[model samples]
Target chain A: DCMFGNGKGYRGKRVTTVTGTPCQDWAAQEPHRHSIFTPETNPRAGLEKNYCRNPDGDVGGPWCYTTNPRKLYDYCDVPQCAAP
Target chain B: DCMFGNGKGYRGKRVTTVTGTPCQDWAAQEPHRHSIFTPETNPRAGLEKNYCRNPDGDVGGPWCYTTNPRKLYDYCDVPQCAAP
Candidate 1:
């Protein structure tokens, strides 16, 4: 599947970043820490199991905090859905 | 990737049926024939390149005319997006 707009509505099961790094769970604080994109704060974002998401409507498209300690976050390679 | 409701809004790039057969283009008539789901009639359905769709809000979710001569159409294996 693909995304529209800033991909805030993306709910696909892609769990890896564009460079193929595993995504860190939004609920976890190790390696990286953030309070804005957690299940407790934004449950509707579908912050499940490190799946890529655009909870903040990032222009970079769906992204996640990476499990790699060297990188904080990166975009996923989700394709854009056809324009409506 | 997944869909919601009857998947009428699904614009995913899934091009195969659940049975693993490649889908026939919505604009083509070989192997299957239908007038209601074609690009000429339902342009907004995203009927492009044989990708599965739910232009008519079918209860079975996104489906498409198959290239298989033995079958006319079949449901896709797209997972359901989490409920909003």
Candidate 2:
């Protein structure tokens, strides 16, 4: 009588800013984190924001939560996706 | 989020139904599936029960999704595997 549950995850989608969207949500939340926005194994689909950090800390992201970029990569690094 | 979202997954963990709970969840819903239990690939964790089919069609499952053994394996298939 054990109960269990699982959740699905998504990769970031191309955003539209005309509706007032900012680029690079690397400072992420549940279900996703900076890992999806950027990765050393597979580069992101879109451009990193001016405030966004670079592959190896080339820059920074502005949501007020700037930390080590390397750590962020590990957060969203899916083992399967990492190989590719 | 870029106005988007993502989700996580789970392994069909062991059951603790020594009390009066049913055993074997080979025929699972959203979170669990036969593939997670049996795969031609990495076959990471989890065990197949008696009601549970074998790596192939070794037996019967009550859920009636008795698929062509191969199809069921592909259902919950994760690709980073296929290794040992």
Candidate 3:
């Protein structure tokens, strides 16, 4: 899967953080990378530190891992919340 | 979580089998334990020894862990495949 790019992925598809807490997660992924997130479609689906946005709020409303830019894990380009 | 009952759950909310491949899984649980499975909803959402069935086929149509009565994990009542 690393063949897709350099650093590991986030908010794209199944991206498991082999580090802290160890979680398997995703918002959506390739073959449809153009897609966006909504409360219904792709909300944060994980237990450990989740990397998603809180819809219906201020810009960057109540983000979890967003507090640590390093947590983005090279996925800042994937959008903050995939918000509506 | 164990307050629910004796046997562990299957196709019911989230039930992580600390045994085997160490899979974290479930279909749906109490509060709505009467629910069923479909290729779209409660399909086998695990890697090793999944406990689900294939829809659009015969009765008990190609079940996974269903093969082993012991594997049902006391959840045979969950309905094979949660079929349609």
Candidate 4:
């Protein structure tokens, strides 16, 4: 789904009530302010996954940290640093 | 010149009396211990280049702290910790 913010009109929940729904209820126990941002939608839960943040495993549902392979010397080795 | 210690019968100078060359005298009062080990061999004036004892630029000309990188954070970019 195309998530839009200020309403250029695309990919997000449609709302005009101006009061806002509480996502803390849907996300369960965590008192998160609900909006397009729900506690269930919290991507920061990514860190708990036990591996480094990446496009596949990180909290980045659609947006992941832009990383350099050379910068990630531990998990992923650089081209020259890798085993041939 | 092949710098050898321990009587390898090679390019080292011939000293049979078994006294020692005074490096503290030659290193100009730096007072390094004397042997074939001259003050001229004190390349360890700075942080060693042959850390972990490589055969190249280190004081590995003979010996040194033949081990790993220490100093707790030598020229590092500090991650996983703040005040280390």
Candidate 5:
């Protein structure tokens, strides 16, 4: 479950792929990616459950914007937020 | 110093006043307002000293937003914020 990439490792996904992977340096077998559940992809998901990325109880979760209590954003956990 | 308010305690500031004050129930000697140095009025000033509210070093303060470390807003203390 490691992820690696090289600037020259571009494939048809975005660059010119030399192999089946998106990156180029699979020869050394390296994974150069971080996995902490960031906002870039899933900023709102976390180790905790039910943290409300959407709206209302029709599809419910817990607390404010992040399932991770450590990631509580101000607007995410305020009375001013309409659907947070 | 406590504050009090009433629905009928309006004055010329927003309502038709019966007295000089914005509110009317001064008879009970009440001051109706919450003052934790909110972002609305003096949002930047706080119990701390060098916290930044405006910009730049020639007119510099401290980190970002209010002087209160307890009130660190997400945008205020973010690495993405240029001056923060």
Candidate 6:
């Protein structure tokens, strides 16, 4: 699926990073810890599962905290919605 | 690309109907005429060019008026964005 704008508006179910690493739950601080995009901080960010999101309005598009202990986060592979 | 909700919020650039017919421009009334989904009525509907849209909030998803004279309108092939 594709995304619009910075992908803060994206609500798709992509749970993997661009490198194929599974995403960590926004509510969890297992492999990574952050207070910015948690369920409490950004309830409207669509952090429904481990789904990739742009809660920070990242210009690089949708991304998520990684399950990998070595990696903090990564951008997703979602393409930008093209203009007509 | 995929869509969310009833696809009323969809802003993809898909310009063809499911039947492979090019969609008619929302501003034109060459083959079909209606006052509902024109640029004048729904400016935020993303009726730019001939892109498929669901300005009427059709549950069947995004659709558009067709260029085919025999057919007034048809649904587009956009898939629904799945939940996480």
Report each candidate's C-alpha RMSD, comma-separated, in the order given.
8.8, 14.9, 16.6, 23.0, 20.7, 9.2
**Model 6 misplaced stretches (Cα beyond 4 Å):** A1-84, B82-84
Score each candidate by Cα lDDT: 0.77, 0.26, 0.26, 0.21, 0.20, 0.77
In model 1, what lDDT does residue A10 have?
A: 85
- Looking at candidate 4 chain A, the ten consecutive residues that score lowest on lDDT are A75-84
Across B1-84, the per-residue lDDT of candidate 4 in tens digits comes to: 222221112222222111122112222222223343232464433223322111232211222221122211111100111101
Candidate 4 per-residue C-alpha lDDT over A34-69 given as tens digits, one digit per residue, 9 for 90 to 100: 243232454543322222222232111122111221
Please give, as one word, the docking class of candidate 3: incorrect
* Model 2, TM vs. native: 0.21
List, for all models, the DockQ compared with the true complex.
0.04, 0.05, 0.01, 0.01, 0.02, 0.04
Residue runs of model 2 more than 4 Å from their true location after superposition:
A1-44, A50-72, A77-84, B1-24, B27-45, B48-84
Error of 1 at B60 (Å): 0.6
TM-score of each: 0.49, 0.21, 0.17, 0.14, 0.15, 0.49
Q: Is candidate 2 or candidate 4 better by DockQ?
A: 2
Estimate the lDDT of model 5.
Answer: 0.20
Which lDDT value does model 1 have at B62? Answer: 77
CAPRI-style class, candidate 1: incorrect
What are the per-residue Cα lDDT tens digits for candidate 6 across A29-78?
A: 88788967889888888888898888877545677889888888876756
Cα lDDT of model 2 by residue, A3-81, tens digit: 0111112233322222232333433443335443443433542233323222332111112113333222212211111
Between candidates 2 and 3, the TM-score winner: 2
Which pairs clash in the backbone of model 2?
A8-B7, A9-B6, A9-B7, A10-B6, A10-B7, A51-A60, A51-A61, A52-A60, B42-B82
Supply the TM-score of chain A against the true chain A for every candidate structure. Answer: 0.86, 0.21, 0.19, 0.14, 0.15, 0.88
Q: List where candidate 3 sits over 4 angstroms from the true fold.
A: A1-53, A56-62, A65-69, A72-84, B1-35, B38-84
lDDT string for model 5 (A1-84, tens) is: 100111111111221111111222211112332233233444333312322222221111111222222332211111111100
Model 2 residue A14 lDDT score: 25
Clashing pairs in 4: A2-A11
